Ligand binder design. Sequence first.
Ligand SMILES: *[C@@H]1O[C@H](CO)[C@@H](O[C@@H]2O[C@H](CO)[C@@H](O[C@@H]3O[C@H](CO)[C@@H](O)[C@H](O)[C@@H]3O)[C@H](O)[C@H]2NC(C)=O)[C@H](O)[C@H]1NC(C)=O
Ligand SMILES: *[C@@H]1O[C@H](CO)[C@@H](O[C@@H]2O[C@H](CO)[C@@H](O[C@@H]3O[C@H](CO)[C@@H](O)[C@H](O)[C@@H]3O)[C@H](O)[C@H]2NC(C)=O)[C@H](O)[C@H]1NC(C)=O
Ligand SMILES: *[C@@H]1O[C@H](CO)[C@@H](O[C@@H]2O[C@H](CO)[C@@H](O)[C@H](O)[C@H]2NC(C)=O)[C@H](O)[C@H]1NC(C)=O
Ligand SMILES: *[C@@H]1O[C@H](CO)[C@@H](O[C@@H]2O[C@H](CO)[C@@H](O)[C@H](O)[C@H]2NC(C)=O)[C@H](O)[C@H]1NC(C)=O
Ligand SMILES: *[C@@H]1O[C@H](CO)[C@@H](O)[C@H](O)[C@H]1NC(C)=O
Ligand SMILES: *[C@@H]1O[C@H](CO)[C@@H](O)[C@H](O)[C@H]1NC(C)=O
Ligand SMILES: *[C@@H]1O[C@H](CO)[C@@H](O)[C@H](O)[C@H]1NC(C)=O
Ligand SMILES: *[C@@H]1O[C@H](CO)[C@@H](O)[C@H](O)[C@H]1NC(C)=O
Ligand SMILES: [Ca+2]
Ligand SMILES: [Ca+2]
Lengths: 48, 973
Amino acid sequence: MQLFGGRYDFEDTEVRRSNFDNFPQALISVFQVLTGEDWNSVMYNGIM
Amino acid sequence: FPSAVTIKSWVDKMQEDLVTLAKTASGVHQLVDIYEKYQDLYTVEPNNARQLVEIAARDIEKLLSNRSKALVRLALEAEKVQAAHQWREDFASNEVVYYNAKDDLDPEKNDSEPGSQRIKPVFIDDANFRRQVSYQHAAVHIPTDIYEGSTIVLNELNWTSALDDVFKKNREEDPSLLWQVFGSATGLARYYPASPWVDNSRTPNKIDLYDVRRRPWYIQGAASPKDMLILVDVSGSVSGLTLKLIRTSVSEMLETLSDDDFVNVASFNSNAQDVSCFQHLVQANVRNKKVLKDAVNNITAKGITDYKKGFSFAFEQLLNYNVSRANCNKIIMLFTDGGEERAQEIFAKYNKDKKVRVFTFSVGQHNYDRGPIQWMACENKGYYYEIPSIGAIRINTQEYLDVLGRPMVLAGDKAKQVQWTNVYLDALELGLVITGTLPVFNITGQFENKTNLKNQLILGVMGVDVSLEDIKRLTPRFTLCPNGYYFAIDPNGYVLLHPNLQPKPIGVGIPTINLRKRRPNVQNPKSQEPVTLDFLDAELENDIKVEIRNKMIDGESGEKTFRTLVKSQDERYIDKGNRTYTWTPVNGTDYSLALVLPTYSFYYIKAKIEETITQARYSETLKPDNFEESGYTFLAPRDYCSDLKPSDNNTEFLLNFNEFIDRKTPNNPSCNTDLINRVLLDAGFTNELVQNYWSKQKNIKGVKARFVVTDGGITRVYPKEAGENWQENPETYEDSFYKRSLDNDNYVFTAPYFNKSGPGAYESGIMVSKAVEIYIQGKLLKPAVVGIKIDVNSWIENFTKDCKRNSDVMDCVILDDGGFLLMANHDDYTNQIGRFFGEIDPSLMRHLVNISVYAFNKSYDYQSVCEPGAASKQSCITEQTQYFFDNDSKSFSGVLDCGNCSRIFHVEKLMNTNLIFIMVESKGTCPCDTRLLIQAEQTSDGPDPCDMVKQPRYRKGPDVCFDNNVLEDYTDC
Ligand SMILES: *[C@@H]1O[C@H](CO)[C@@H](O[C@@H]2O[C@H](CO)[C@@H](O[C@@H]3O[C@H](CO)[C@@H](O)[C@H](O)[C@@H]3O)[C@H](O)[C@H]2NC(C)=O)[C@H](O)[C@H]1NC(C)=O
Ligand SMILES: *[C@@H]1O[C@H](CO)[C@@H](O[C@@H]2O[C@H](CO)[C@@H](O[C@@H]3O[C@H](CO)[C@@H](O)[C@H](O)[C@@H]3O)[C@H](O)[C@H]2NC(C)=O)[C@H](O)[C@H]1NC(C)=O
Ligand SMILES: *[C@@H]1O[C@H](CO)[C@@H](O[C@@H]2O[C@H](CO)[C@@H](O)[C@H](O)[C@H]2NC(C)=O)[C@H](O)[C@H]1NC(C)=O
Ligand SMILES: *[C@@H]1O[C@H](CO)[C@@H](O[C@@H]2O[C@H](CO)[C@@H](O)[C@H](O)[C@H]2NC(C)=O)[C@H](O)[C@H]1NC(C)=O
Ligand SMILES: *[C@@H]1O[C@H](CO)[C@@H](O)[C@H](O)[C@H]1NC(C)=O
Ligand SMILES: *[C@@H]1O[C@H](CO)[C@@H](O)[C@H](O)[C@H]1NC(C)=O
Ligand SMILES: *[C@@H]1O[C@H](CO)[C@@H](O)[C@H](O)[C@H]1NC(C)=O
Ligand SMILES: *[C@@H]1O[C@H](CO)[C@@H](O)[C@H](O)[C@H]1NC(C)=O
Ligand SMILES: [Ca+2]
Ligand SMILES: [Ca+2]
């Protein structure tokens, strides 16, 4: 939440739904990186 | 350097030489003599320009009242018809049969969607429509993203199908009527007669995105004019996908706005600034909106949201009352994502009685709370609209007119007033046109006042076009000379009818398209703007014309006579023309109509020839096999009779003209006698010249070609070899030189063009013209313009014999008014002949203006095309310069200095002509440039708008404004 909260303000019209904006959502995103699933596409949104 | 008397004596022997060559070879005094020799083939009648205007003002009254009656009956039927509709939902059981525009008409297709059944119509080709059309039924336009077969759409095509009987009853009564259409609230439009739409959906690769609701004609009759004020939320949360969406909604919201509507655009993030340079509500014309749509785009989101400073700034903007204003519906719309504060305090006072209407828009996909925004909308009798997507922008930024129309539909019959739109290009390619609209209301169970839940919306709007070519048939200009014309005007200053007005849309800014970001096959929107040229932009502005223009916006009558300068037909000259204006109001409407005449045009010639042999004998004069002793004759494409058509290939036309008089006597019971007759009389007057005068002197030495462009269209170039080079318009009321010859009392020289294509220099030559000027019973007339194309080579020999060809001591040139170069001594200049003299030695020309020898006026042409700039054609503004003598003094001596050198130039003006002779020391002795003073249509983006609107042009708004009925529902959001 500190690093990526409110930082997904991209002007594309596409959906980046595993983000870090609430606490429930952040928790879900964190769980998805531990299961390994699509974890790097969560990282590219954080580099961008 | 020769003395001032030597240049004086040497000009006087070569202006005496050109004028004697032109007075003798053209035959000015001979054509004067034969107009006066006869006296009795014609009579001389007056143009009573009080009377003519009054007569015209009434054919446009009756035309636009006849259109209106048709509009009223259609509306009555629609209201009555839909009050007896049952709302069925079984449509696969009972098909709705209608013809759908923008569908393949190929019989073998057979798509047959459920609920609907199409029509294959038969499509005769037509005139008054320049497209194939069917008169047996009305077509239906469904917009593209709207599905047809929806119960909401299927039920329109059911009840609206009773209009085809009233559609037919309008055209039976009036054959001339143009498109008749009902634009539905549902977004479905039906027009008569039926024709295929211009863009099919998927059969080409361009796809129409045309919506009836969006249309300007639909909008003006939907609702009353309005002072809106867009708030934009620019807080940090908006940045992202949502910020992107807002910039496209506001641009979209504006499309909706009209000239009668005023609008400003503000923006808040803990302070409310205003998005551009304006600070008050401005007229929301094509230009102002272009400024606002260019400042909405550059916005950056940052900072705390404050709805209290955003609505304080909005209300203050709403209360200016010093500026010019619409003063009708006052509404404020805010684009924002989520609000935690309802700002209850700002609304209590600023709008305690709810005079203002608030519309809140929630945009993008987000989690911010929407309850407060909805509450604001509900409290203020506005509405709420979400926009998540780009495809959702187009139907929500047009939908607020369902709310604003409500206190109009509660006004009853008082609200059923015809209004006429600004001129605009027709959807179907008809040309420039205006539409008269009327709104249809949803009355169901009126007898007993049973419902009213959805009875506060309009069913839709009904329109009928008038083409501007129909109004130009009520304002006939043939009796009057080329100089005279009729101008029509809004109460907004826009010109309904003008010679200057053109089909191309009026352009704003310098067009910049990025080629690096247009993917090749997607088809962006083309245009929808109205063609709003203003009277002070169709003509050169004075102060004695802003008096005339304001005086006939506020519906007065009058006349005025003054000296003003006319811009020439081609954009190169300016001629001081003593005009008289005369205006009156069209009493049915808000248009006021005027008429310009030049003193001397107060009398016209009517042909009074009726003998059998005399109309016969003059008619074989214009036979193309008989041009070996007559001269390559031309003929202007007037609408002589209804049957023979203007063809733009003139040898085609003159055969179909002259076949017509052989195959039938000129009495012609469906054809105007005077127009054809005058032409016949004229051809026996440009014959007796070409027989008894020009064919005597078969070759004059310096004379190339000899013409008589006359009134009756008949131009006669004298050798057929010369008539191949005659590159003029054969319509005599469109020739530039014809019109400059009438203003002047002296021989006029026309400079040839520089570069270009076709032979226009040595081959044809520079031309002199001069209007014929006769007096009948002490009454001035100018019937015709004689002329000569000069030979440029011979003229040089006379000129050469202190200037020596290719001399290095000093060079001398002859320049006609306007500064164009006709003759150059050096020959490094006479190759570039007909060129603006400030492009071949810009240092001298710059000085000449300073000495007061030359004067100029830059103007703006709001209808012109240009190539884009990187940042096939768009419309743009060009600035245009013309040059003209402002000082009557004959000679001008002096010296110009560039720095470290002097050049002594001597200037003398030839008497009796526009030509000027100047002697100066060779350019090579002082190496000087300043910058190249050029005279061309020069792309530019002025005038700047932010300075026009601080002192706007006078204007008069609509008398009736419908808003704030006390019994409005104000409960649905
Ligand atoms: C909207 O569509 C409906 C459905 O097509 C139209 O209703 C139809 O109207 C016609 C004439 O009004 C009816 O024809 C009549 O049929 C009866 C027998 O049912 C016969 O006795 C009459 O002499 C006449 O032939 C037709 O039946 C009726 N259909 C139904 C299902 O009631 C309606 O006219 C359309 N609305 C408009 C405004 O066009
Ligand atoms: C003009 O106003 C009338 C009402 O004043 C509108 O008619 C109403 O149309 C609605 C459409 O939603 C009808 O409601 C529908 O009822 C059917 C039952 O037949 C139901 O299945 C639907 O879910 C929906 O509720 C309603 O019957 C009808 N009201 C009356 C009194 O007839 C009419 O739509 C307006 N005109 C136009 C062109 O929209
Ligand atoms: C336009 O209508 C006005 C009246 O509104 C006309 O003015 C009348 O002119 C007649 C003579 O032409 C006078 O007898 C009347 O007194 C005038 N009206 C009034 C109220 O004084 C005007 O003639 C009409 N013009 C056109 C071109 O139709
Ligand atoms: C168009 O050109 C004329 C030049 O003949 C301008 O008229 C003069 O304007 C100056 C100020 O620019 C005045 O001092 C003179 O008294 C004017 N003379 C006459 C004869 O009118 C005119 O201003 C120009 N129009 C525009 C819009 O620049
Ligand atoms: C040149 O002078 C001769 C002799 O005066 C004259 O005949 C001729 O017309 C002049 N050139 C022209 C046509 O300007
Ligand atoms: C107006 O309508 C009447 C009656 O149909 C007709 O005689 C007249 O020519 C019409 N005028 C115009 C300008 O269409
Ligand atoms: C303009 O009016 C004056 C006064 O009536 C007249 O002398 C002058 O000739 C008119 N202008 C022109 C170009 O004829
Ligand atoms: C004439 O030239 C002088 C010197 O260049 C300049 O000061 C003056 O403004 C010029 N006159 C006009 C009418 O511009
Ligand atoms: Ca895995
Ligand atoms: Ca915010």
